[PDB]
Each structure stands twice: as C-alpha cells, then as structure tokens.
C-alpha cells in the first residue's frame with residue numbers, strides 16, 4: 001500500500017542538487033535521483049518547494065511525504081524521522097574571499113560574519129561552537145541569499161556542504177573571487193553520514209520501496225550515468 005502520489009519537499013536553493021531553471025522547472029541531482037526512484041517504485045511524485053527549515057515540520061504534519069533536499073542523516077534527526085540508505089556523501093567547508101586568512105577556527109572567526117542556512121547541520125554546529133563564543137553567526141532562510149550577501153561583502157564567510165559551494169557558487173561567474181577557506185570541517189556529532197530521503201518513522205513500506213529502487217539504480221549503472229552529468233569525482237563516497 002504505497003501512496004498513489006508521493007509529495008517530495010525540496011528547498012530549491014542548493015545547486016547542483018536542487019534548484020529551479022529559468023522557466024521555474026525543478027532541476028538538479030536530487031531531482032534526478034528522486035524521479036528515477038519514483039519511476040522504479042511505480043508511483044507518481046510531485047515536487048513541492050519549501051524553505052529548508054520547514055521541511056521536517058511539513059513532513060511530520062503530512063504536508064509532504066518525503067524530503068529529498070541533501071538532508072544529512074544525523075543522530076539527532078533520526079530521533080524524529082526515518083531515512084533511506086545513503087544517496088551521496090556530504091562534508092561541510094567554509095568559503096571566503098580568495099586569499100582570505102580565514103580558517104574554520106574560533107580564533108580566526110571571532111568578530112567575523114558567518115552565514116549558515118537556518119535549520120541545517122551547519123547552523124547547529126556554528127551556533128554551538130562559534131556563536132556562543134562571539135562569532136557573529138547569521139542564519140539565512142535559503143542558501144542563495146548567503147552567496148549574495150557574501151559577494152555583497154555583508155558576510156566574511158559562509159559554511160555549507162562543500163559540493164554545493166564548489167559547483168553551485170565557486171565554479172559559477174559570481175564565485176570567481178572566492179575560494180574554500182581551510183579544510184573540510186569534520187564533526188561526526190553534527191554533520192551525520194551522507195544524505196538520504198527523510199520520511200515519517202511509521203512509513204515503513206515507503207522507506208523499503210525507496211531503498212529497493214536506490215539499490216536497483218545503483219546496480220545497473222544508472223547512478224553513475226546520472227552523477228557524471230554533474231560531477232567528475234565519486235560523489236557517493238564509501
């Protein structure tokens with residue numbers, strides 16, 4: 001008894017995984033994976049755009065049935081929702097102006113302005129580690145606003161998923177004068193282990209269907225065909 005229509009929420013501001021083209025069509029690797037899996041599940045899927053922090057609220061309120069929005073599988077989210085198996089990996093990394101002295105350390109960030117997406121794992125991390133000790137951490141409704149404030153010079157740095165920053169901004173015309181600032185920030189407690197489809201705990205049948213379709217499209221080479229459309233590296237990880 002899978003549903004006839006599955007409503008999938010995504011934030012649409014996190015290129016190359018989820019965004020809108022010029023006609024307003026939903027595009028990105030997450031969109032591709034979600035439609036490929038829907039097809040294999042033999043269900044209809046509708047995509048619903050939402051701010052990222054309203055997604056897990058909307059899932060529990062049954063406004064949507066699934067989240068595919070580079071949602072990191074963390075210990076803390078697992079207490080509220082369920083996840084499919086890993087769709088791809090995601091480390092976090094800071095970006096700042098090319099030739100910035102900035103490092104991801106309190107010492108370097110004290111009194112700087114750091115943007116983070118509200119509701120993300122980066123916001124939780126920065127609020128605990130940097131905001132309490134006086135780094136001016138600013139939370140934003142969506143990641144696009146962060147890039148704009150950054151190029152505007154309202155922010156000194158931003159913390160987000162490394163591949164989103166690299167392909168969605170640094171390799172774009174607007175990110176030409178910016179670069180990664182220090183190495184990836186690793187913290188098991190905050191960033192979880194890769195991303196997956198977020199689902200209500202009680203929707204067991206739906207989790208099994210997504211996991212099965214994911215196994216199948218990975219086994220027949222589709223995952224790699226789809227990922228070579230965006231990445232020249234192993235996006236899945238281990």
Ligand SMILES: NCCC[C@H](N)C(=O)O
Pocket residue numbers: 011014052069070071072090117119120121122161195
């Ligand atoms: N769409 C925002 C994704 C950011 C980070 N992976 C998280 O799960 O919070």
